Every structure is written in C-alpha cells, then in structure tokens.
Design a protein around this ligand. Structure first.
Ligand SMILES: Cc1cc2c(cc1C)N(C[C@H](O)[C@H](O)[C@H](O)COP(=O)(O)OP(=O)(O)OC[C@H]1O[C@@H](n3cnc4c(N)ncnc43)[C@H](O)[C@@H]1O)c1[nH]c(=O)[nH]c(=O)c1N2C=O
Ligand SMILES: [Mg+2]
Ligand SMILES: [Mg+2]
Length: 641
C-alpha cells in the first residue's frame, strides 16, 4: 500500500500510534478506537502526499484539498496532524520550494554551533518556523564530516560516502530534493593475500563463515548467557572474540588428542596380538598307540591350533584396517592456519572500519544496539560527491565561516556565544541569543585542554556521558589515476595484512563505477597510527600493495593524492561515535538532553550524530537529530501549537 509505505518511509508503524503521538494527542488515544484509525489514515496520507513530491512545501490547505471525502471534513484534526508532522520535521524538511513565504519579523534568536548536516538541518527548520538563526562554523566550508575532494575531473569523499539503504531513510527525500544520483554498491569483494595472491572462492567462504559463527557466538554469550562483566569491568567485543577463539582451539586440541589415543590403543592391540601370534607359531613349530592313531592325533591337534591361529589372523586384519582408517581420517591439526587467521583478520578489520574503532574498545552488549533500526534496500554511493547535500542545505542560511566558537555562556535570561576568527585570532565576536544549539562533534566535546568553555560548566551527568562514549577514527587515501588498471566489474577488493595488529592497514580498496580513482581505507589500530605518516610514504605503501596484485608495471604513478587525518583534525578529533565498553544507548539520550540554567527555561541544546541512539554515527542520524532539536526549540519558544 501507498499510505502504509509512507508510514514505513517515515520510520513509523502504519497501524498504531507512537508514544510521542500519544503525548500530543491524548484525546485521540483515550478516545474511541474508530477515531484512532482516522488519525492514522490522516497521518499516513499526509506523509504520502509529502513523500510523493518533497520538492514543494505541503501546506495544510493542500493536504485538506487532496484528502478524500469523509476525511476532507476532519478540518481541525487534519490541521493538528499537519502541525505535528511539520513541527517534528516528518514533512516539509530538507530543501523544497516554499508556497507561503516567511514573515519578515522573526521571533527568537538561535545560535547554531557547527554547520555540519545536523546544524544545517536544524537551521532550515528553525528558519522555516520563522526564528532568527545564525550558524557559526570553524572551517572555511560547510558540511563538517561530509567532506568531498573536488579537483578537475576527480571527485572523492573523505568523510561520509555511503547511503545505507533507502527504506525508511530521510536521505532518500533529501537526495530526491537535490537531484543527487545514487548507485548501488556491488557486493563482490575478492581478497588478495599480502603477496598479491587471490584468495580462492572456497577459502574465502570458509573463513567468512567462521567469522559469522564467531560473531554469533559472542552474541549468544552476551544476550543469552549474560557474560557482560569480567573482573568488575564491562567486557569488550574483542575480548569475547578471543575467548570464543580460544574455546575453538581447545576443541580442536581435544579431538586431536582423542584421535591419537584411538590410534595408540589400536597400535597397542596389534603389538599384543602379534606377540601371541608369534608364540602360537612357536607352539605349532614344537609340535613336530598305533602309528595310524598317532597320525590322526597329530592332525586334529595341529588343526585345532591352526583354527586358533586363523581366528587371530582375522582379528589382525580387522585391527590393521581400523588403524589405516584412523590414520586416513584425522581431524583438523589447527583451528586456523597462520594464513587462515590473517584472512579472518581481514573480516575483523572490516568490522573495525564499520565501527571506526578497535574491537577491544566496543561494548560486547551494546556495540550493535541500533541494528533494529537499519534501513531496507541496497547500500548506495553518491554520483558526484556527498557535499551536494550540505551545500544545498546551506542555501539561504546565515552562516559565519572561519568562526571558531570558544565560550558558551547561558543564563536564565539568555545566552552569549564567544567566537574567534581563524584567519585573524585577534578579532573576537560576541553573539547574543535566546538559545544555543550545540552540534560540536563528540571528539571536540572530549578534548582535554577543552576547545570550548561552558559557563556554568556542563553538569556531571552530561560530562560523564561525554567521557564514557567512544569516539572512533577511520581514514582514506585517495589515489587519482589516468586510467583504470583494475577490474571495473568490482567496486571493492581486499588486501589481507601481515599481522593482527596491522590488519586495518589499507585493508580495502574502493572504486566508483568507471572513474579512475581508488580509495584505500585505513581502519582500527592502524587508523590513528598511520596519521603520523606523510602522504608520499602512505601512497607508496598503497602502490606496493597494488603492484603486488596487478603487476609492478600495470600500476602508474597517481596524478593526484589526498589523505584524511580525522583524529588530528581539530574540528572533528576523530570520525564518529561508537558504543564503548562501559557505555550504552542511554548515553546517547543523555547527550541529547538540553541544559536549563537554574522554573528556568532550557537554554543549551544538543544535536549531532552522537545524540541519536537509534541512528548514531551516520548522516541520516545527524540530519534527524537536527530536525528533533529544531522541533524541541520551536516548541519551547513559539509554543507547541
Ligand atoms: C571518514 C568518515 C566516514 C564516515 C562518516 C564519517 C567520517 C569522518 N560517517 C559519519 C557521518 O559523516 C557523521 O555522522 C555526520 O556527518 C556528522 O554530522 P554532525 O553530527 O553534524 O557533525 P559534523 O562534524 O558534520 O558537524 C560539526 C561541525 O562543527 C564544526 N565545529 C567544530 N568545532 C567548532 C567550533 N569550535 N566552532 C564552530 N564550529 C565548530 C565542525 O567543523 C563541523 O562542521 C558516515 N556517515 C554515513 O551515513 N555514511 C558513511 O559512509 C559514513 N562514513 C563511514 O562509514
Ligand atoms: Mg564456531
Ligand atoms: Mg604489527
């Protein structure tokens, strides 16, 4: 269905009210069931109208005109649903043509720190709600962790680059709006060992299968057996993995031992049967009244011994057969060979890439707490660089670039934000406002020697959440060539590293369809460490790997190279949050919580990828967090109309 799909596209249940809807419509949820289904149909249809054409504003008027004929008479209820959906950024979000323009007089002043996707999304909302909005951005560009390299015909994304499925993803709407073409990522990812040799199909699938079983087993240990605490310390995913690996190695040693015992037993039995057979032979030997009765007597005596000997020879045959059968079918000598382990490490590296951190830092219990909210559909890349999104969202907004915020003061009567110019650190600005929306990356909030001061320091419940949460790292080397020397039918191929410690080093190479660019990813422990290597040396290390795979003559010098260093970047201090051991999804809720000065009204608000528990560490999460806070701020200052 269309209306059912609209709800789904909006991350809502089509056939029931959410608790947030319950709060805003207490009369509906406590009323007759018939009216609840009217509510849901109006909601689902209003969403559909928006999603069918998100390039224009969906007004209350137009919703009412397009509703069919009992519902177009629910005038008041339709207005209430429209208002709710609009306020919460489920319709009329992103970039679209306004039908009713903004009042020239603006109500309330909001300073937004950061113009990444969350700041930009929030700003458009607050602006379209008729508030006065200024964004202060430290960089000489918008977009933050959406960072596109553009030079000549080369386009490459240094930050976010993947749209993780369209089904339920608000980036589907934003992409439609900016005419951003999306292409599917082909799944085939052949692996090459450190020497350049392809990993054959059979091996690849065996090791991948083991990877999945190992992960499944940690999930079992955590959520079925509750193995989440050791030595009064929360257990990490990495820690649990090594425990599961040790158990597998033990199992292999056990079955090996049992086999050796069966062999030794059978060897013993043979030896002992040989002995008595040797002695029976010696008894046959030393067996060498009428003459004729003596002849008969020796005959029956001797054939009694030969019948005895045949019985034993039969058992000799059965034992030698059993022995040969055991020596032919031993079980595995090892759980994983050195080579097998290295390949398994590639899969671990890949997981460290997705989570932006070594596995030993991830919470066993909570690392994947957000899996339940993953979107449906194939994962996609952007045709002409992801920066099209924040650039488009910036249109019409008041953005102060090269303006690094240093102090935030907030009181029961208002707020002040002090910033400095980053080209001339002498000149300092003071910005007055009724509300501050903080979109500083978690890494910036963690910074020791702090980058930004809060007068009233942030309360302990906030700072302890900041401290508990992980902020990861992940980097890329962009290699721009004259020609495609790799297979154009693969988007991805893997480099199996030499050690466990260095498994994340240039472990994955990425290409977009028919562009002469390779992206080499640096993940896990290698990510932070490799930042201390100059571009030339790291590019050199890339070329060496590529030469080992494609041939030392098939690989030309790159025309252009770029290398991200997200941890060293002072405006990021890493790539994105991860659920650290000792933290949980709750810390994301805590990060989202506004601060009241000390009934004083809330003054300091928080958005960004680290403040949304269901969608952290993503562009859509950043976007949704922005819509959320805009909603809450407008409710505070313009009333929950
Ligand atoms: C290498 C890499 C890869 C991926 C992703 C990320 C990365 C890095 N991420 C995360 C998102 O980029 C991020 O969550 C979001 O952009 C944050 O979006 P966000 O939560 O809005 O954070 P931001 O850092 O973009 O915005 C904060 C802004 O604040 C500015 N700022 C900082 N200090 C300031 C100050 N003192 N004063 C004023 N402004 C200041 C800073 O320059 C920046 O513009 C992905 N996202 C996604 O969906 N698909 C992906 O492929 C990926 N990707 C990998 O997997
Ligand atoms: Mg197993
Ligand atoms: Mg090493």
């Amino acid at each position: 269905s269309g209306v059912e799909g609209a709800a789904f596209q909006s991350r809502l249940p089509h056939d029931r009210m959410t608790s947030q809807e319950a709060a805003c419509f207490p009369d509906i949820i406590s009323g007759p069931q018939q009216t609840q289904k009217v509510f849901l149909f109006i909601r689902n249809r209003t969403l559909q109208l928006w999603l069918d054409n998100p390039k224009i504003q969906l007004t209350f008027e137009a919703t009412l005109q397009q509703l069919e004929a009992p519902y177009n008479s629910d005038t008041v209820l339709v207005h209430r649903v429209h208002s709710y959906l609009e306020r919460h950024g489920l319709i009329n979000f992103g970039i679209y043509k306004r039908i009713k323009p903004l009042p020239t007089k603006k109500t309330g002043k909001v300073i937004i720190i950061g113009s990444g996707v969350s700041g930009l999304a929030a700003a458009r909302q607050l602006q379209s709600f008729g508030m006065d909005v200024t964004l202060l951005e430290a960089r000489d560009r918008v977009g933050g962790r959406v960072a596109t390299f553009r030079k000549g015909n080369y386009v490459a994304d240094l930050g976010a680059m993947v749209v993780t499925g369209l089904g339920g993803n608000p980036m589907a709407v934003v992409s439609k709006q900016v005419n951003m073409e999306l292409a599917k990522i082909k799944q085939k990812c052949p692996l090459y060992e450190a020497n350049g040799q392809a990993v054959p199909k059979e091996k690849d699938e065996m090791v991948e299968q083991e990877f999945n079983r190992l992960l499944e087993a940690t999930s079992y240990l955590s959520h079925q057996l509750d193995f989440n605490v050791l030595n009064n310390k929360p257990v990490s995913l990495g820690q649990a993995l090594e425990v599961v690996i040790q158990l597998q190695e033990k199992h292999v040693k056990d079955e090996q031992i049992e086999h050796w015992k069966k062999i030794v037993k059978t060897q013993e039995e043979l030896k002992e049967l040989l002995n008595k057979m040797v002695n029976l032979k010696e008894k046959i030997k030393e067996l060498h009244i009428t003459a004729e009765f003596l002849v008969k007597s020796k005959h029956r005596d001797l054939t009694a011994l030969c019948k005895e000997y045949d019985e034993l020879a039969e058992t000799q045959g059965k034992l030698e057969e059993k022995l040969q059968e055991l020596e032919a079918n031993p079980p595995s000598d090892v759980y994983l060979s050195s080579r097998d382990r290295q390949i398994l490490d590639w899969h671990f590296a890949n997981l460290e890439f997705a989570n932006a951190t070594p596995l030993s830092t991830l919470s066993l219990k909570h690392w994947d707490q957000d899996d339940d909210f993953e979107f449906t559909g194939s994962h996609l890349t952007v045709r002409n660089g992801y920066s099209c999104v924040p650039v488009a969202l910036a249109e019409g907004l008041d953005i102060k670039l090269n303006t690094a915020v240093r102090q935030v003061r907030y009181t029961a009567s208002g707020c002040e934000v002090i910033a400095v110019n980053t080209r001339s650190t002498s000149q300092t600005f003071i910005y007055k406002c009724d509300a501050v929306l903080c979109t500083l990356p978690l890494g910036v909030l963690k910074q020791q020697p702090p980058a930004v001061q809060f007068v009233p320091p942030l309360p302990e419940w906030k700072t302890s959440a900041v401290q508990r949460m992980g902020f990861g790292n992940l980097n890329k080397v962009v290699l721009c060539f004259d020609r495609v020397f790799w297979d154009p039918s693969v988007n991805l191929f893997g480099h199996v590293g030499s050690t466990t410690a260095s498994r994340g080093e240039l472990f994955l190479f990425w290409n977009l369809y028919k562009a002469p660019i390779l992206l080499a990813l640096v993940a896990g422990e290698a990510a932070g460490i490799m930042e201390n290597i100059s571009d030339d040396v790291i590019v050199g290390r890339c070329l060496a790997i590529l030469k080992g795979i494609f041939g030392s003559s098939a690989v030309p010098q790159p025309k252009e190279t770029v290398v991200s260093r997200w941890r060293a970047d002072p405006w990021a201090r890493g790539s994105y949050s991860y659920v650290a051991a000792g933290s949980s999804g709750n810390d994301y809720d805590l990060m989202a919580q506004p601060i009241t000065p000390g009934q004083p009204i809330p003054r300091l608000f928080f958005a960004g990828e680290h403040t949304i528990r269901n969608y952290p560490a993503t562009v859509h999460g950043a976007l949704l967090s922005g819509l959320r806070e805009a909603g809450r701020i407008a409710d505070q200052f313009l009333g929950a109309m």
